[PDB]
């Protein structure tokens, strides 16, 4: 939000302010395998071409970092008990670099919908084709705390990389997806080996009840629609247990 | 209780009846949502079956697992005033009798009965 | 979040030590980094109790 | 309703009660099949929950979540003559009174009983 | 049907009840264990549906889909003695009348009430 | 349970990995459900639903086979878990179609 | 403490008794999950062993190696009043005496006892 | 409970108390078999954790994880007399006083003490 | 016994309280060491189970695995003065009486009692 002028100019105060407070756009050169898999995604036969087109276009908004589809916890059923196919085109967006958890307020995503579909939607007054309606959505955060037990016996490199991988996995988890214990254990087992003791635990801060969260018996963390898991902190309980035993 | 822990309100679901009078906001009325990924909570089923068990044991009758008409039987016994046990002593003026008065099922004491008949 | 480079050198007593493994690009979010480190000069002088 | 939408007839499965009276064939009685695995439908459980909860709130009572005998208490309220509120006015000759008559849970109006006492 | 075949006892689960009077010993009061992936058995639900349907069908009533308070209506008909049929012929002296005598619901013979009124 | 909805390539990969994992299983070693689930999480990713169950053929009892409370196929020793047939099925509905 | 630091609550496992008053959040009530892969933490079994050992060493008694019932002896000597050492001094002033006064177990002073015998 | 479910009886292992008085076959006394392919069951360990926690909570005491002598302190408070609450209400005739009586830890009503003190 | 066969002393580990008094050099106070390739020895768990179960069966009570507070009830019965049964006969001059005495909880003989009250 605040910055200084490098070169001094007479009569101009050195303190300048980032109008808006964010600096979008920065991206790196596209590699060869990424371009190959993007080009192969153009020739091949694609059902529901409209949804992928809209996602690729919406990814061009400033500071949009990730785009996700409607998660599995976001389906629905009629009274008879059959899945209903959605008639619109809806998905999420994640500004992982500007807001907290990447979740934006409702106004930003409303502006993105107005730019993408038009007003009123479906008239071809926007990027989307004629008769193409829908809506971009956001999610609300649910703070989850993650505790790793049994990691002190690993070499510092292993514990460090496991912490980093668990953090990066929870941060990139799409909205409307459960945070199962089995996923974290396999981020652990894939490093520590198949005969290492490792136990993870997912809790809520201060054991407070949060909207859009249910702890299944398993110990997982069911998260409902329009909500997203958010890493509060990763704590390691190194109760002095080591390999030597001193 | 017999409601789902993380459910929805009556008007956000189907086969859901609202207007249920519950004691304290602590345990409100929430029903299973209409989403493919919902499995019936076994504990809620335990609460329901416990409720029907507590109800079926009323009037002293014991439950039978083989036959399935038991709640009908206890309900019939409820509307079976002929099954009400006879009184051992003699009633006085302060006792009560049930009857349909002006269309509503109410009660009246023996004293008002003798007052009306003596007129 | 600070920046790190491969030119880290530590001064323990009278000896100098250097990273053995590859230094991570950024200091981890914990705020603490543990690094495998080897001496710069071979021999029995690099051994120490510090 | 409380039945399974895609279920089978009563005689084709187990633990099914036949002869259930319903308003037309548009409300058929179907139960889960013992064959190919099926998960109980959450919406049908919502129907069952709504039914039980509506039963609890009868007679002006409220639902409780701390204990699990509510329907037992409601069944005690039924068949308990004493509960019934008293009548404000005097019981007129036209009103009816309850009582077991020739082993039948019938009712007789005050006219006949005054005739008996006078006779 | 009810009391899931492979269930525990009261304190080995949650929301269960005890004192469940059961005919014989082969009909044990069991409840779903509270562990991971236990799934409600369809057949049990079939049995619960049968019980609820018999309860609603009692008193000669019929079940409806568009109403979620059928059990409430049947309970109200169990109460509200004004729903009982009138007595066709004249009553005799050995009949019984229901009422709250000394705080307990009981029946008293017509002979006693006539002895009372003549006094 | 729940592979039919994944593209046929992923289903073929998961099958040729599960059969090969169970073939090479050392004698006297449990075929735990976790080890099988984690073969689907690697190709299918964290956004898929994919359940795994182990059963005896025709629900018959076999000498030296028990099932743990978590569903693990516990094997008494001097025995070895040999694959009979891997079967795919779908009972949980989802919007993977449409 | 004796609680597994990477643990759960009651409603997330079995054989866990919560309602455990602790002196702050730094010693929370946590238990082992209902999984078949977790291993019991030896540094917690040390806490349980220390607890029971300090329990046995109460009253100056010493732990012993051929008797699996040392805690039983400690409990007996805890309740059995007669093994309490004889008061090596003459009674005096208001040395309270225990008893089941009015139902609640308590103690009364000497003078409070002499007031009733004086009368 | 605190016994291992799939274990052997007392006389088929080591460090196993024999003659444990349970409350029926339902809760059999089984201990961990020797063998080798056996690990402490975490669900079993939860039971011991809970029993010790409840014991510590008894007598209104709260658990502290910084100290390892909690059960010892609750035992000492169990034996100690004037840890008991003082009594304010006047001792009626029919209260109790405990002590030694023919080498037995019993109590006697105030009647006997006053009657003996008459002499 | 309840200790680890090849463990360490108190100060060479964590959650290990020492000062434990044992009879002789055999089976001394050894606790699990802080090595993460060490698992709990099942036989030591059999010993701790034996100790808890024998603690339960004190006072002739029976252990129920369905409940998680048996030791709490045992401790309550230990401190409950009113638990002590009535003495079968009349007391005499040598019997002893409980209570605290100047903060020196002990027993008092009826002899000095009558000597002080007769004054």
Numbering used by the authors:
A (entry chain h1): 150 to 395
B (entry chain v1), D (entry chain w1), E (entry chain x1), G (entry chain u1), H (entry chain z1), I (entry chain y1): 3 to 121
C (entry chain F1): 100 to 149
F (entry chain G1): 298 to 395
Task: Quote the study that presented this structure, word for word.
The contractile tail of Agrobacterium tumefaciens bacteriophage Milano is flexible and bent to varying degrees, which sets it apart from other contractile tail-like systems. A contractile sheath and rigid tube assembly is a widespread apparatus used by bacteriophages, tailocins, and the bacterial type VI secretion system to penetrate cell membranes. In this mechanism, contraction of an external sheath powers the motion of an inner tube through the membrane.
We have determined the structure of the distal part of the tail comprising the baseplate with associated receptor-binding proteins (RBPs) and two baseplate-proximal layers of the sheath-tube complex to ~3.2 Å resolution. The structure of the central spike complex of Milano, which consists of BH and BCS proteins, is similar to that of the central spike complex of R-type pyocin (PA0628–PA0616)17 and phage T4 (gp27–gp5)48. A similar Fe ion is likely present in the Milano BCS because the cryo-EM map of the Milano baseplate shows a spherical peak of 6.5 standard deviations above the mean between the side chains of His166 and His168 matching the expected location of a Fe ion. The similarity of the Milano BCP organization to that of the pyocin (PA0626) suggests its central role in the function of the baseplate. In addition to the BW4 C-terminal domain mentioned above (residues 346–396), the Milano BCP protein contains an N-terminal Tube domain (residues 1–127) and a middle Helical domain (residues 141–345). Similar to the tail-sheath assembly, the Milano baseplate also features an extensive disulfide bond network. Considering that the BCP must leave the baseplate to allow the tube to move and sheath to contract and that the wedges of the Milano baseplate might be required to splay out to initiate sheath contraction, the baseplate disulfide bond network must be almost entirely disintegrated prior to sheath contraction. The Milano RBP complex contains no such fiber but includes at least four different types of proteins—TSP (gp124), STF (gp31), and garland (gp125 and gp127) that are connected to each other.
